[PDB]
């Protein structure tokens, strides 16, 4: 599993409130979170399905 997939979501320093997805490795499912619009970390997807394709595990 890519290393970033286990990290908590990162809103970042931005003031925007965009709804993104992170892989919740303890649930084994994608979670929404609020993203501030700049300086994303890698556990940050535009869809549940992208989060699971990248982070869901072989």
**Method used to determine the 3D structure:** X-ray
Could you tell me how far CA 48 lies from the centroid of its own chain?
A: 9
Q: Which of 53, 5, 2, 51 is nearest to 30 (CA)?
A: 51
CATH number of 1-58: 4.10.410.10
User: b vs e for 2-35, b when ≥16 Cβ sit within 10 Å of the residue's Cβ?
Assistant: eeebeeebbbbeeeeeeebbbbbeeeeebbebeb
Task: Give the integer Cα–Cα distance in Å for 56 and 37.
Answer: 24
């Amino acid at each position: 599993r890519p290393d970033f997939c286990l990290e908590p979501p990162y809103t970042g320093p931005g003031k925007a409130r965009i709804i993104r997805y992170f892989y919740n490795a303890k649930a084994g499912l994608a979670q929404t979170f609020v993203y501030g619009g700049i300086r994303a970390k890698r556990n940050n997807f535009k869809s549940a399905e992208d989060a699971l394709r990248t982070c869901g595990g072989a």
